[PDB]
Structure 1
């Protein structure tokens, strides 16, 4: 059975509430780096072939209503780890276009360790069975049928894995940008 995970089991603990702001600014710099790497510029006049992205909203002046395009990939990472009983262990911390140019850290530099490779595979195996069941929940009440890739793990493709391994490691790559190593236990 494809195994989903929930986000509303517990309120967010205090060592993890003040964690979000560095994680949300880092997920802001990575949702912008994918789109602003070709020649798109945020502006006013909205179309498809006029090289202006209206969806590129900044992180600075955002209120409560227009937050759920950034926090929505976050709530499927932070509270989903909080759906098993995982408490973060902390260690010693350490290390053109026209518009928004963040001096952030790319996700193409973090090579994990053994305690984090064995933990991120628990997240990367998890993320495939959620969306496999998310489409199962989407496609059973509309006259649902059968899906090809609900099969066991060694009989999949590479593009759906590489697109979902990166988001599961988006915690651990950013946690090694901050430098807090996690133990397995």
Structure 2
């Protein structure tokens, strides 16, 4: 990973903190030492410091994925990355602890239209954050050509027919 992408990760963390703090001021949450969800006190003003820390790694993983591998296509591909790693973890823990079957034990195509939006929300967020800076990424006539190919095929067929007539 390059160093100004190292910058970009810190800038993303900062702006995610700014959006979360916008939510904090919108809902009127106030900081405190004690941890609780009903009394409206937070040690990092719901989220623990670890519980914001954890969102640091999946961005790096998805970014490595985009580096090793249009806009909506990359969005749904990052969303599929998220859902695939989520399904992998859930399947491993199910086969580990003997858990029951989940309704998400299906491929990404048969799935419903709602989880689509659920997994594309943050994908669109990080993609906005990506295009704000300037870094542009991608995946990494025809009729005339088809007509020409058909003509060549017809010529070959005519040659074959002439040969057959000779035979």
Q: State the TM-score, normalizing by the size of structure 2.
A: 0.63
Alpha carbons 2:62, 2:81 under 8 Å: kept: no
Is the 1:127–1:168 contact (alpha carbons within 8 Å) kept by the matching residues of 2? no
Once the two structures are TM-superposed, the CA of residue 36 in structure 1 deviates from its matched residue by 4.5
Moved more, 63-72 or 76-85: 63-72
Name the residue aligned to 1:78. Answer: 63
Q: Cα deviations across residues 117-175 of structure 1 (Å, max 9, x unaligned)?
A: 12112111222121111111121111244332232334323443322212223321112
Return the alpha-carbon distance in structure 2 between the equivalents of residues 70 and 148 of structure 1: 25
The alpha-carbon deviation at position 39 of structure 1 amounts to 2.0
Larger RCO, structures 1/2 (Cα 8 Å, 6+ apart)? 1
**Structure 1 residues 14 and 49: CA distance shift in structure 2, 3 A:** closer
Match of 1:124 among 79, 91, 94: 79
TM-score of the superposed pair, with normalisation by structure 1: 0.58
- Contact 2:69 / 2:139 at 8 angstroms: preserved in 1? no
Q: Structure 2 vs 1, CA of residues 15 and 79 (structure 1 numbering), >3 Å: closer, same or farther? A: same
CA apart distance, 1:44: 2.7
Note the residue ranges of structure 2 that are not aligned, 5 or more in a row: 141-167
Q: Give the count of matched residue pairs.
A: 140
**Cα separation, partners in 2 of 1:146 and 1:64, compared to 1, 3 Å:** closer
Q: Which has the higher helix share?
A: 2
Per the alignment, do residues 65 and 158 of structure 1 end up closer, same or farther by CA in structure 2, a change over 3 Å counting?
closer
Query: Are the equivalent residues in 2 in contact too, given 1:41–1:52 (CA < 8 A)?
Result: yes
Q: Label 1:139 to 1:63 Cα distance change in 2 as closer, same or farther (>3 A).
A: closer
Give the RMSD, CA atoms, in angstroms.
4.0
1:36-67 CA-to-partner distances (Å, cap 9, x unmatched) read: 432212223432221222244xxxx9999997
